[PDB]
Amino acid sequence: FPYPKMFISISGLIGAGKTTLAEELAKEMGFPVYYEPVEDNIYLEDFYKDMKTYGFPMQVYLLNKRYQQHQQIIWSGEGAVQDRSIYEDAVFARILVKQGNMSKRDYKTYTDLYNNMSKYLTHPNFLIHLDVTPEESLERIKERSRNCEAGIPLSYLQDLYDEYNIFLAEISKRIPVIRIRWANYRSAKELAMRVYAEMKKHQAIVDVPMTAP
Amino acid sequence: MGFPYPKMFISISGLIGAGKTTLAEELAKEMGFPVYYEPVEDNIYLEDFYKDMKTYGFPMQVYLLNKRYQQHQQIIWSGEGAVQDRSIYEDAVFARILVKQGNMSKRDYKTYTDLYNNMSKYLTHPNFLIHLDVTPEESLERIKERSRNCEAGIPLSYLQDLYDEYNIFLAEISKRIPVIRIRWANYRSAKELAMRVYAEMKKHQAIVDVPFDGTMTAPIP
Ligand SMILES: Nc1ncnc2c1ncn2[C@H]1C[C@H](O)[C@@H](COP(=O)(O)OP(=O)(O)O)O1
Ligand SMILES: Nc1ncnc2c1ncn2[C@H]1C[C@H](O)[C@@H](COP(=O)(O)O)O1
């Protein structure tokens, strides 16, 4: 019987290593993996020069990409590991509003659009959050050395961190969430193996006292 | 200034006569959700089905799929979460025991599962499954206490088929979504059952922290 396919998303701060974990976890499980390559984001350079002007249009542009990716996932008829979830764009939007880089009117326009869109977007069975600090994220940004990210201050990554933690407390009411500390001491392969094992552990039927197996 | 996090959908599962609608109602009351269910009288095929399972089995599955579809459109239109007293997966559990018994052909079963798969994107998929665990013997006794005329001829073997198929279904579906399996034992009412179910749901939905490389960066509210 065509039981629904397994959809797994990774979340975490900039530079956390979401993409590496997605590839390794997708290997472990036998699933196709899906990325959004940063070079394809034609707004990103301008956004970092002027967040207030380019924030809202980039959010719409990124939502279009998430919509194409779901149609691709649905068409595949298989499970999937995604290196980013649809909820993370909303995280970025809320901090931009907080910082005065997005108007409250544009934010509401954006969330109405997201709400209208969601029915045709990917909703994960399982969310894996890579737990890293803002300082670790800043260091991973510096080591990667993307020119457009060279200007990001720590305060921006702290806002993002704070918003992610609020979001996780809410989203975990709806879907299983594994939050896994990764400071890059153990390997990405060990990380994926532990994520997989923790997923299997959490997916066991809860029996409440039976007669079963 | 909030965000439309996805809505929560809970389905109750269990054998004939297990008391799923009452558990659904009390759980929805405890959670502050609407509850949705299908009165048995609205199934205009059920009486013919029990007189002749082989003739009416397949058309009833299609008919019931239409009901699950309208019920999902209603839930989506509501813009709220929902507790439902039956999941869309259970009709297929019945279809498989009908094929095993020779009451539905392999070809008709394949037609049905193709239809379900084309349908599934416009149907309700639960975030959480609550399975009421009752034995075939307990189910037969609940059927007699309720005394639906169309159910009077149901033999124990039919309920044993159903019970076995449910256990297979629970093994697969629990790979995709959280499942709580709960026995009637010692609970005096659905309200008492519901309160334990709700407590277990909150416990199972806690974030799993894995201090893989080191201590978690901060506790989460
Ligand atoms: N909705 C959004 N709003 C603003 N910036 C976004 C955004 N979505 C992504 N970005 C930015 C943040 C980063 O500069 C880049 C994301 O790359 P990444 O998070 O570092 O992946 P990885 O962890 O695998 O290294 O794009
Ligand atoms: N898909 C399918 N095929 C055959 N018979 C079905 C199906 N769905 C429900 N039923 C029958 C089973 C019971 O007689 C009644 C539900 O009663 P309750 O006590 O609420 O479970 O309806």
Author numbering:
A (entry chain A): 26 to 234, 239 to 242
B (entry chain B): 24 to 244
The study reports:
The lack of RNR makes G. intestinalis and other Giardia species completely dependent on salvaging deoxyribonucleosides from the surroundings to make the corresponding dNTPs. The reaction is catalyzed by deoxyribonucleoside kinases (dNKs), which is considered the rate-limiting phosphorylation step in dNTP synthesis. The enzyme was found to use deoxyadenosine as its main substrate and was consequently given the name deoxyadenosine kinase (dAK). Here, we report that G. intestinalis has a deoxyribonucleoside kinase with a 1000-fold higher catalytic efficiency (kcat/KM) for deoxyadenosine than the corresponding mammalian kinases and can thereby provide sufficient deoxyadenosine triphosphate levels for DNA synthesis despite the lack of de novo synthesis.
To structurally characterize the active site and investigate the substrate preference of G. intestinalis dAK, we solved the structure of full-length G. intestinalis dAK to 2.1 Å by macromolecular X-ray crystallography. The ASU contained two copies of G. intestinalis dAK, of which each subunit showed a similar fold to the homologous structure of M. mycoides dAK, as well as human dGK and dCK. However, when we superimposed the G. intestinalis dAK dimer contained in the ASU with the previously reported M. mycoides dAK dimer, we noticed that G. intestinalis dAK dimerizes through a different, not previously reported, interface (comparison of violet/cyan and orange dimers). Taken together, the convergence of X-ray crystallography and cryo-EM revealed that G. intestinalis dAK is a homotetramer, and that tetramerization is mediated by a combination of a novel dimerization interface and the canonical one also found in M. mycoides dAK. The N- and C-terminal extensions reached across the novel dimerization interface to interact with the neighboring subunit of the tetramer (half of the tetramer is shown). Thus, the extensions of the dAK N- and C-termini make multiple, specific interactions that appear to stabilize the novel dimerization interface that leads to homotetramerization. After crystallographic structure solution by molecular replacement, we identified unbiased Fo-Fc density that corresponds to ligands bound in the active sites of the crystallographic dimer. However, the number of phosphate groups differed in the two subunits: whereas a dADP, with a partial occupancy of 0.5 for the β-phosphate, could be modelled into active site I, the density for active site II unambiguously allowed for the placement of a dAMP. In G. intestinalis dAK, the adenine base is held in place by face-to-edge (F72) and face-to-face (F117) π-stacking, and hydrogen bonds between the adenine nitrogen N1, N3 and N10 and Q84, an H2O molecule and Q84 and D114, respectively. Finally, the α-phosphate forms hydrogen bonds with G40, K43, R109 via an H2O molecule, and R169.
